[PDB]
Amino acid sequence: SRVAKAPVVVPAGVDVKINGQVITIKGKNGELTRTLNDAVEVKHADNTLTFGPRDGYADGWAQAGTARALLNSMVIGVTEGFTKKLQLVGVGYRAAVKGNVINLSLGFSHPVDHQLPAGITAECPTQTEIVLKGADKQVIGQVAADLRAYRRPEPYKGKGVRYADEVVRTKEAKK
Amino acid sequence: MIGLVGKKVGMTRIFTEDGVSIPVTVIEVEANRVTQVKDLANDGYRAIQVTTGAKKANRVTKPEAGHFAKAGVEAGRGLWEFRLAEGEEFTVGQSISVELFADVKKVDVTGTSKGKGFAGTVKRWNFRTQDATHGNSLSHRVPGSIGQNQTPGKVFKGKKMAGQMGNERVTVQSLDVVRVDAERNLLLVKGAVPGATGSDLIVKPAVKA
Amino acid sequence: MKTFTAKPETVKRDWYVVDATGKTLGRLATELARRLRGKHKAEYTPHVDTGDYIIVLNADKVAVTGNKRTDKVYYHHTGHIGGIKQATFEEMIARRPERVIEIAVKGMLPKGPLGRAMFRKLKVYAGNEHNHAAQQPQVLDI
Amino acid sequence: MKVRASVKKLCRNCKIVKRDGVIRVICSAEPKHKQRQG
RNA sequence: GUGAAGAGGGAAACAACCCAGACCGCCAGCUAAGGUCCCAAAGUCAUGGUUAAGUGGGAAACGAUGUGGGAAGGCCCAGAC
RNA sequence: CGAUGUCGGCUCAUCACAUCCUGGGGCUGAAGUAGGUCCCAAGGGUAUGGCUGUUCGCCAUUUAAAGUGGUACGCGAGCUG
RNA sequence: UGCUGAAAGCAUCUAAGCACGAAACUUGCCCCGAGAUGAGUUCUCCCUGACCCUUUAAGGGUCCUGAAGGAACGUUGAAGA
Ligand SMILES: [Mg+2]
Ligand SMILES: [Mg+2]
Ligand SMILES: [Mg+2]
Ligand SMILES: [Mg+2]
Ligand SMILES: [Mg+2]
Ligand SMILES: [Mg+2]
Ligand SMILES: [Mg+2]
Ligand SMILES: [Mg+2]
Ligand SMILES: [Mg+2]
Ligand SMILES: [Mg+2]
Ligand SMILES: [Mg+2]
Ligand SMILES: [Mg+2]
Ligand SMILES: [Mg+2]
Ligand SMILES: [Mg+2]
Ligand SMILES: [Mg+2]
Ligand SMILES: [Mg+2]
Ligand SMILES: [Mg+2]
Ligand SMILES: [Mg+2]
Ligand SMILES: [Mg+2]
Ligand SMILES: [Mg+2]
Ligand SMILES: [Mg+2]
Ligand SMILES: [Mg+2]
Ligand SMILES: [Mg+2]
Ligand SMILES: [Mg+2]
Ligand SMILES: [Mg+2]
Ligand SMILES: [Mg+2]
Ligand SMILES: [Mg+2]
Ligand SMILES: [Mg+2]
Ligand SMILES: [Mg+2]
Ligand SMILES: [Mg+2]
Ligand SMILES: [Mg+2]
Ligand SMILES: [Mg+2]
Ligand SMILES: [Mg+2]
Ligand SMILES: [Zn+2]
C-alpha cells in the first residue's frame, strides 16, 4: 500500500539486474540477491524500482510492500552497509576478535567462541563493546541476537549483553 | 574400522606391578586372509570377505574350494565379511594380522552365547518365584498371569515366556584391550566375552570409543 | 445369448509411462486405479484383470494442496502393543517416497486377490528413468 | 505467560497479534500482560 | 406411524429412521429416498459466490484488527489518521 | 439366574496423561540458593517395614521421586483363601 | 525465543522469507530379518546321450547315464525336549 506505492530509487554505483523474480543488486559494498514472491511485479522506471501486485493473486500489496522495504534495505546495504553495536555490562565480561571469530568471556566455566558469517565483519574498540558491520540487515540482526542470547541481560542489575540502544527495565529485589 | 576373526582360548589374569589382577580373555587371532573384495559397482557396498584357520581338504566342497582358488588362497574354517570405512581398502589375497589392533584401546567382541536350552521365566527373564509355602498348589516357578480379562482376549506380542535361552549372537562393547602379542597371534582383552571355549569371535574396534 | 466376459488368456495389456511431477496425488491415483482396473476398456469384467501396466516416475515430485505436506499423517501399526507408528508426508518423501503413490492406489483398488494383482502392475520410481524399456511403453498424460 | 480462553488488552501498550493461529497479547511495558489463548 | 407379524433400496454396519408394501419368471425400461473421483452403478456437469479451518468430518459460556457482504455515521486537500 | 466365581494379597503386567522424578521453557510480590504458578513433554524410572483381613490410612526410616487413573473396581481353566 | 518484514506509512516472530530450540519423533547402539510371494544381490560348482509315439505340446514313453551336492547310518558335542 503506502509503502509499495513509493518507488525505490536506485542510486549511482548500484548495479541492478532483474531476472524474473530474482533481483541482484550489486554495489561498492557487495552484491545481494533475492527471489521475490510470484505475486510481486517489479520494474525499473529508469531511475526507480516500482512494486505492483501481479495479477491473479491475493496478497498483492502485502507482498509488494515487503519486497519494497527489502530492496530498500538491500540498496542501503550495498551502498552504505549496516552497523549494529552491542555493549557488555558486567564484571569480567569481555570480548575479543580473531578475524571472523569472537572470543567472549561471559562468566562461564568455558570460553565462548562465535563464528561470524560471510559478509559480516566485526570489531571490538573496547573489550566491553562489539561493533559489527555488514551488508544484510537480517544477518546483522540475527548475529546480534545470537550474541545477546548467551547472556540475556538480567533485570536486577542490567548485567549481561545488551544492544547499545535498548533500554533495560530493572527490578528491585524486595523483602 | 574393520575387525578380525579369532577364537576364544580361555580366561586368565594379568598381575600388574601395582598388585592389580586384570581378568583377561585370550583370543588367538590367526592370519585372517581375504577371499573377496566387494564394491559398489558390482555389489552395491564396500566390504571384504575373509577366512581364517584351516579345514580338511576332503571336506571342503568344490564350490567353496573354487571360491578360495579364485582368490588364490588357502582355505579356512569359515567366511566372514567386514564393511569397509572410507579411505580404507584391501587386496584379495592379503593376510591381516593382529597388529591391526596394536594401537586400538577398546574393542567390541561379538560371539555366539552358550546354549541354555529351554529355559523358564525365572532363569530367562528373571521372574520372581512365587511362595514356596503358605499354600501354593503346584505353582512355585510358574509365570503367573499373562494377560487381562476380556478387554483384549489375547496375549500381547513379545510377552515374556519360556523358551530357548542362549545360543545366539551377542556383542559385548568397549572392552579394554590389554596386550597384543603378534608373535603368537594373541589378543588379551579385559573381561569376559561371549561364547564357550573354542568358539569363533569377531573383534571390531569400538564404535562408542 | 449371454453377456460377453473377458478371458485372462485372450486379454491384451499395454504399457504406459506417467510422469508424476507436479501432479495432484489423488487425482493422479484415481486415473491410475481406473486404468489398472480396466474401466477404460469395453471388455471390462469385474472378475478379470483387464488393466494396463503403468510405470510412474518422478514420484518424489508429486504435489499435494494445502498444508498436507506437513499435516498429512500416515499411521501404521507393527502388531506389537505400543506399536503405533506415524510418519508425515514429507518424511515419507524423504525416507521412502514410492509408498505414497502405492498407498493411495492400493486404497483405491479393490480388496482381494484381484486387487492385489492389479497392484502388481503398478511400478513406481522416484527418479526419471526405468529398466523397462524392453516393453516398449507408450507415454500417457494424466 | 498467562494462558486463558479470554485474552484482553490490559494496558495501553498491549497489542493483540495472531501468531500461527494463536491470539496473543504482548505488552512492551509489563511482562505480566503477555497472554496466550488456550 | 413403523416393528412385532414385513422382505427390498438408503442411512458404513444399524428390529422401531427415510423411500417403498415381495404371486412366479425374464441377461428389458422408467423412477423414489439417497446419490454421481476411486473402492462402488452414475457429472472430475455448467454458471455465480463463500471457506483456508482438512472447517467440512464432534461440543458451550466467553474471547479475537480472521474474512466476505450490506445500511448508516464523524474527521478529511480550509490537509485527516 | 438350563451359573458371567464379586474383597484383599502374590506373580505377570499393559495403556492413558489430567507428569511424581528427570528434561525444556514463560511469569513471579523471581537477589542467589530454594520456591510458587502455568505451558510443552509419557523415553525411562517411580520405597521397605510396624498395626490391621483389609484397599485406604496412621506411624517409623529412606529416596531423584515414592504419580493419578483405565484395564470384568486387570489377573482364581495362574496361586492363595 | 527471535531476525528481517509488510498487510495497517508506525508497530508486529509471519502473511512471503530466515535462525535457534527438549529425556519426546526419525537416526545413531544391539538383535532378528528376502515367505520383503515386491520371494532381491554377489561368488563358486555341476550336468553338453541316443531314440520312439500322438492328442504336436512348457507333451508322453524307452534305453543309457546318475553329476555338484545332499540325505541316511555311525562316533558324537561346552548344540539339544
Ligand atoms: Mg548348552
Ligand atoms: Mg515372592
Ligand atoms: Mg488341592
Ligand atoms: Mg509345592
Ligand atoms: Mg477382537
Ligand atoms: Mg484447557
Ligand atoms: Mg425392512
Ligand atoms: Mg433398511
Ligand atoms: Mg448408519
Ligand atoms: Mg447395507
Ligand atoms: Mg433426486
Ligand atoms: Mg466391497
Ligand atoms: Mg463408477
Ligand atoms: Mg468443475
Ligand atoms: Mg445370573
Ligand atoms: Mg450355558
Ligand atoms: Mg500435557
Ligand atoms: Mg517454571
Ligand atoms: Mg511411565
Ligand atoms: Mg512407554
Ligand atoms: Mg528416542
Ligand atoms: Mg505399607
Ligand atoms: Mg513382630
Ligand atoms: Mg472402576
Ligand atoms: Mg477385580
Ligand atoms: Mg489397578
Ligand atoms: Mg481368569
Ligand atoms: Mg482373588
Ligand atoms: Mg476363565
Ligand atoms: Mg516494519
Ligand atoms: Mg518485525
Ligand atoms: Mg538433540
Ligand atoms: Mg540419561
Ligand atoms: Zn500490557
Is the separation of the CB atoms in B49 and B35 below 8 Å?
Answer: yes
Which strand (E) or helix (H) includes residue C9?
none
Is the separation of the CB atoms in B4 and B32 below 8 Å?
Answer: yes
To one decimal place, what's the resolution in Å? 3.0
Assess B158–C contact: CB distance below 8 Å, yes or no. yes
Assess B153–C contact: CB distance below 8 Å, yes or no. no
All three cell numbers of C80, joined, read: 506389537
Please give the biggest Cα pair distance in chain C.
Answer: 58
Instruction: Report how far Cα A12 is from the mean position of its chain's Cα atoms.
Output: 23
The residue to which cell 542501503 is assigned: A76
Is chain D adjacent to chain C, meaning 3+ CB pairs within 8 angstroms? no
User: In degrees to the nearest 10, what's the CA dihedral of B42, B47, B53, B59?
Assistant: -30
Is the separation of the CB atoms in C26 and C33 below 8 Å?
Answer: no
Residues of B in contact with C81 (CB under 8 A): 156-158
**Nucleic acid strand E within 7 Å of C47 CB:** no
All three cell numbers of A30, joined, read: 557487495
Where do the domains of chain C lie?
A: 1-142
Is the separation of the CB atoms in D26 and D10 below 8 Å?
Answer: no
For chain C, counts of helices (H) and of strands (E): 5, 6
From which experimental method does this structure derive?
Answer: cryo-EM
Query: DSSP 3-state helix, strand, coil percentages of chain A (rounded to 5)?
Result: 20, 35, 45
All three cell numbers of D4, joined, read: 486463558
Distance, CA of B98 to CA of B5 (rounded, Å): 10
B148 CA, F4 C1': separation in Å?
A: 15
Residues of B in contact with C83 (CB under 8 A): 157
Assess B134–C contact: CB distance below 8 Å, yes or no. no
Residues of C in contact with B158 (CB under 8 A): 80-81
Distance, CA of B68 to CA of B89 (rounded, Å): 20
Under DSSP, is residue B159 helix (H, G, I), strand (E, B) or coil? coil
Is the separation of the CB atoms in B130 and B139 below 8 Å?
Answer: yes
Q: Which of the other chains make 3 or more beta carbon contacts under 8 angstroms with chain D?
A: none
**Nucleic acid strand E within 7 Å of C23 CB:** no
CA separation, residue B188 to residues B22, B39, B51, B195, B197 (Å): 10, 33, 21, 15, 14
Give A99's contacts (C-beta < 8 A, 6+ positions apart): none
Question: DSSP strand E in chain D: where?
Answer: 2-4, 14-19, 22-27, 35-37
- Nearest residue to A29 via CA among A139, A135, A137, A136: A135
**Nucleic acid strand E within 7 Å of C33 CB:** yes
Under DSSP, is residue C122 helix (H, G, I), strand (E, B) or coil? strand
Under DSSP, is residue B50 helix (H, G, I), strand (E, B) or coil? strand
Distance, CA of D23 to CA of D33 (rounded, Å): 13
Neighbours of ion ligand 34 (CB under 5 A): D 10-11, 13-14, 27, 30, 33
Distance, CA of B37 to CA of B50 (rounded, Å): 9
Helices (H), B20-164: 62-71, 121-125
Is the separation of the CB atoms in B170 and B116 below 8 Å?
Answer: no
Q: What backbone phi and psi angles, to 5 degrees, belong to B96? A: -125, 125
Distance, CA of A55 to CA of A58 (rounded, Å): 8
All three cell numbers of B89, joined, read: 581398502
Burial of A150 (0-12, 13-18, 19+ CB in 10 A): middle
Burial of A27 (0-12, 13-18, 19+ CB in 10 A): buried
